[PDB]
């Protein structure tokens, strides 16, 4: 770290009116009460009403940026039709240098922390001047908060019980 902090790239309020945002899950909990990760969001339709999205951002802060997102893999289809109303998955997370698309299906998996479902997590750096875009037909995890930073040099990592 030379600088590192947390900001609100896309406030939960007023970013996503047209998708219900507030859903969470129960293994992700706090003092035995359900929750979900602070920095991110679920999106689903407005009473079974999914429109598809295109949103973007580029830096004004002039510092470097660190960005995270997710790609939903249900364990069953009834979720997929119920929430997002397309068996088709197609996301396109796009930048100048990096870009990638995502087109998953349901893959059943075994229970792990009482979960068969999965969301594969994906990330990138973004520099000043450059733009990120997200495009999707659902099956997403979006940023609520993102990590502003400068670089750092030479510090690192320890595993220790001391």
């Amino acid at each position: 770290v030379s600088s590192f902090e947390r900001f609100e790239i896309f406030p939960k309020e007023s970013s996503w009116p047209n998708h219900t945002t507030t859903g969470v899950s129960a293994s992700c909990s706090h003092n035995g009460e359900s929750s979900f990760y602070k920095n991110l969001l679920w999106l689903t339709g407005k009473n079974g009403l999914y429109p598809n999205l295109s949103k973007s951002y580029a830096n004004n802060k002039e510092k470097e940026v660190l960005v995270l997102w997710g790609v939903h893999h249900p364990p069953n289809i009834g979720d997929q039709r119920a929430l997002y109303h397309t068996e088709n998955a197609y996301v396109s997370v796009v930048s100048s240098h990096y870009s990638r698309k995502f087109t998953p299906e349901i893959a059943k998996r075994p229970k792990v922390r009482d979960r068969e479902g999965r969301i594969n997590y994906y990330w990138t750096l973004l520099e000043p001047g450059d733009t990120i875009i997200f495009e999707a037909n659902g099956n997403l995890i979006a940023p609520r908060y993102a990590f502003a930073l400068s670089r750092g040099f030479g510090s690192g990592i320890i595993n220790s019980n001391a």
């Epitope: 129960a26 009460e33 407005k46 009473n47 979720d79 119920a82 479902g117």
Partner: single-chain antibody, 236 residues
């Protein structure tokens, strides 16, 4: 959340007949947003229809509905004396507030929860209820406490999502207080400052799969299941 209006609160009709029932609101309100129940007096409610078209589990084919926006509708293909019942209209506010139609009597012419503590207190008094779960994961679902006066329109007293966003009515709030326990598989409702408006039969209700879990449970934006309820009263 919006005031509803059922149409009609009671009706009298013959066998081998349809029955059109229209539950309409103040505003236009988007359509996978309602669900539809029945209840026999003495029995708890039972789930029938959701989102103005689509049909629940363990079913015939006869009850079927339509409508959109401001005016939602459930219709019936055939009437039978086993249907002798009050049907209800229960909607999930975007303000996370269930709202209720006033029940609609069909007259025909010629797993579980368990409640705890229903009974009497003095008015202006104080009392608690509990509920307790059986054969599921009380972790997941968004819960609701509900009321009903005898042969009257329901009222939605309270509910809470599993991440802590409470919702009460502006009248009932502060006098009631809830608390949930998933490791216990049980629920609590401590209550104070109690008057004759609370003289009614209450229900504990399991609702909505939040987002994510293993299971052969899907979800709706309907209830999951009710409980048998219990009477509560003030008097002197």
């Amino acid at each position: 959340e919006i005031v509803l209006t059922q149409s009609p609160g009671t009706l009298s009709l013959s066998p081998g007949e349809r029955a059109t029932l229209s539950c309409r609101a103040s505003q236009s309100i988007s359509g996978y947003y309602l669900t539809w129940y029945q209840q026999k007096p003495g029995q708890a409610p039972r789930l029938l229809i959701y989102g103005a078209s689509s049909r629940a589990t363990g079913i015939p084919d006869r009850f079927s509905g339509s409508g959109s926006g401001t005016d939602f509708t459930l219709t019936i293909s055939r009437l039978e004396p086993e249907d002798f019942a009050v049907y209800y209209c229960q909607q999930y506010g975007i303000s996370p507030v269930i709202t209720f139609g006033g029940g609609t009597n069909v007259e025909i012419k010629g797993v579980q929860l368990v409640e705890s503590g229903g009974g009497l207190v003095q008015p202006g008094g104080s009392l608690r209820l509990s509920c307790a779960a059986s054969g599921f994961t009380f972790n997941i679902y968004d819960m609701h406490w509900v009321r009903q006066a005898p042969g009257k329109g329901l009222e939605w007293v309270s509910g809470l999502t599993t991440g802590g966003d409470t919702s009460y009515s502006g009248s009932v709030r502060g006098r009631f207080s809830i608390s949930r326990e998933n490791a216990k598989n049980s629920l609590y409702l401590q209550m104070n400052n109690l008057r004759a408006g609370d003289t009614a039969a209450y229900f504990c209700v399991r609702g909505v799969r939040e987002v994510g879990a293993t299971g052969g449970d899907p979800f709706y934006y309907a209830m999951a299941v009710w409980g048998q309820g219990t009477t509560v009263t003030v008097s002197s």
